[PDB]
Amino acid sequence: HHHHHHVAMSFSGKYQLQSQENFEAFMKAIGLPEELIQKGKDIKGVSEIVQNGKHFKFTITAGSKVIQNEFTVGEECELETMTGEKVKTVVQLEGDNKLVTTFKNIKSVTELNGDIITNTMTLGDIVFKRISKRI
Ligand SMILES: CC(C)(Sc1ccc(CCN(CCCCC2CCCCC2)C(=O)NC2CCCCC2)cc1)C(=O)O
């Protein structure tokens, strides 16, 4: 029962929305329309995470709209948000299945734990959480 062995972890896989904290507080603060907020907590969207050595891909799926972003780890690359805001940043791995990135005042800390994703964002005095699980 349960057999695995590897040095690093595989980001490659698809994950569905499970749970969330400070979603409305964060979304109202970044200035999202209340339609995208009511559908965003009511409907469970889908996520995908893809790793290609130094390259990295991420698919966001919020009910029907799909956003695809690409970046290269340790190199300056431009990332699109849910509203279409394109912002230059770099993403670093801490060697522990966890990617960290910062734009201005929004502190992203991603974490992968096998079949579970844990995403923790912090914009100023607001602290948004997202949890997803493998499909
Ligand atoms: C159901 C759905 C629609 S799925 C969904 C939606 C949004 C997120 C973002 C959260 N985020 C924080 C950081 C937010 C900025 C991020 C930059 C690159 C990709 C776009 C946004 C993030 O993914 N960080 C890193 C990023 C690329 C490298 C590894 C992960 C994640 C899943 C929902 O959650 O509503």
Swiss-Prot record:
**Sequence positions bearing N6-succinyllysine:** 39, 44, 54, 65, 86, 98, 129
Biological process, per Gene Ontology = cellular detoxification; cellular response to hydrogen peroxide; cellular response to hypoxia; fatty acid transport
Q: Which InterPro entries match?
A: Calycin, Fatty_acid-bd, ILBP
Q: Which residues carry this modification: Phosphoserine?
A: 19, 47, 64, 108
Q: Which residues form a coiled coil?
A: none
Which superkingdom heads the taxonomic lineage of this protein's source?
Answer: Eukaryota
Record key words, sorted:
Acetylation, Cytoplasm, Lipid-binding, Phosphoprotein, Transport
Q: Phosphothreonine is carried by which residues?
A: 59
GO MF annotation list: antioxidant activity; chromatin binding; fatty acid binding
Positions where N-acetylmethionine occurs in the chain: 9
| GO CC annotations on file | cytosol; extracellular exosome; nucleoplasm; nucleus; peroxisomal matrix
Kindly list the places in or outside the cell where this protein is found, as annotated in its UniProt entry: Cytoplasm
What the entry lists under CDD domains is as follows: FABP1
The UniProt entry, under SUPFAM superfamilies, shows: Lipocalins
Q: Which PANTHER family match?
A: FATTY ACID BINDING PROTEIN (PTHR11955)
Domain-level remarks: Forms a beta-barrel structure that accommodates hydrophobic ligands in its interior.
Family statement drawn from the similarity comment of this UniProt entry? Belongs to the calycin superfamily. Fatty-acid binding protein (FABP) family.
What is the annotated role of this protein in its UniProt record? Plays a role in lipoprotein-mediated cholesterol uptake in hepatocytes. Binds cholesterol. Binds free fatty acids and their coenzyme A derivatives, bilirubin, and some other small molecules in the cytoplasm. May be involved in intracellular lipid transport.
The name on file for this protein is Fatty acid-binding protein, liver
